[PDB]
Amino acid sequence: ANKGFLEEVRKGNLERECLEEPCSREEAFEALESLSATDAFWAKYTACESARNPREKLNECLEGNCAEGVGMNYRGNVSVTRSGIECQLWRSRYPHKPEINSTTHPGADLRENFCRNPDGSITGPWCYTTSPTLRREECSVPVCGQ
Ligand SMILES: CCCCCCCCCCCCCCC(O)OC[C@@H](O)COP(=O)(O)OC[C@H](N)C(=O)O
Ligand SMILES: *[C@@H]1O[C@H](CO)[C@@H](O[C@@H]2O[C@H](CO)[C@@H](O)[C@H](O)[C@H]2NC(C)=O)[C@H](O)[C@H]1NC(C)=O
Ligand SMILES: *[C@@H]1O[C@H](CO)[C@@H](O)[C@H](O)[C@H]1NC(C)=O
Ligand SMILES: [Ca+2]
Ligand SMILES: [Ca+2]
Ligand SMILES: [Ca+2]
Ligand SMILES: [Ca+2]
Ligand SMILES: [Ca+2]
Ligand SMILES: [Ca+2]
Ligand SMILES: [Ca+2]
Ligand SMILES: [Cl-]
Ligand SMILES: [Cl-]
Ligand SMILES: [Cl-]
């Protein structure tokens, strides 16, 4: 947050400016050292608004081992779908040509074949499946706070 006066003379600090106070994308950018880091942080940050209080809740959401809300914040290592289908590598173009990837969604952390919810799918974190007949399916990930 920018209370207006001279705080902006200080070098950006993520803890002070974004975690101890709400911040704008530009503030986050100033506090971080790259666009990559900014895209990643901003995606995790916005996906955790429903959990900014208390800090323990916010930190858990940002860590992303559990899904908050619809799970756009999820960054865990589950790579199998609900029905048990092994997830397809996000970077692979087979058996399904991904409409969603690193380019269309930077900061979504679409690594390997881990489940993610880059488009805010209502059924939670998902992944393109290795089954030729099923393009994508949601995964079973633990919900934050339960
Ligand atoms: C330099 C003073 C300018 C303000 C003139 C108003 C009258 C005097 C009252 C003083 C209170 C307001 C101080 C505001 C100001 O300029 O902030 C100085 C900054 O350098 C401090 O920055 P920083 O610690 O990052 O921001 C404040 C915020 N509570 C935080 O934790 O981020
Ligand atoms: C979750 O998955 C990540 C990503 O594969 C694992 O971290 C990687 O671990 C390898 C060693 O096995 C390192 O070479 C990589 O640098 C790590 N990837 C990065 C840069 O994040 C991590 O160990 C896994 N943890 C769990 C929960 O199993
Ligand atoms: C992302 O998708 C676009 C078109 O959908 C494609 O041009 C690009 O090569 C893809 N890259 C990834 C993230 O695999
Ligand atoms: Ca501030
Ligand atoms: Ca600021
Ligand atoms: Ca700043
Ligand atoms: Ca602090
Ligand atoms: Ca403050
Ligand atoms: Ca600024
Ligand atoms: Ca700036
Ligand atoms: Cl396809
Ligand atoms: Cl990868
Ligand atoms: Cl899905």
CSV table of N, CA, C and O and ligand atoms in Angstrom, one decimal, residues 91 110-112, ligand 12:
chain,number,residue,atom,x,y,z
A,91,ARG,N,3.5,-29.1,-21.0
A,91,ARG,CA,4.3,-28.7,-22.2
A,91,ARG,C,4.1,-29.7,-23.3
A,91,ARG,O,4.5,-29.4,-24.5
A,110,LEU,N,2.5,-23.8,-14.4
A,110,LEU,CA,2.1,-25.0,-15.2
A,110,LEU,C,3.3,-25.9,-15.4
A,110,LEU,O,3.8,-26.0,-16.6
A,111,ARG,N,3.9,-26.5,-14.4
A,111,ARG,CA,5.1,-27.3,-14.5
A,111,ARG,C,4.8,-28.8,-14.6
A,111,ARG,O,3.8,-29.2,-14.0
A,112,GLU,N,5.6,-29.5,-15.3
A,112,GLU,CA,5.4,-31.0,-15.4
A,112,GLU,C,4.0,-31.3,-15.7
A,112,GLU,O,3.4,-30.8,-16.7
B,12,CL,CL,7.9,-28.3,-17.1
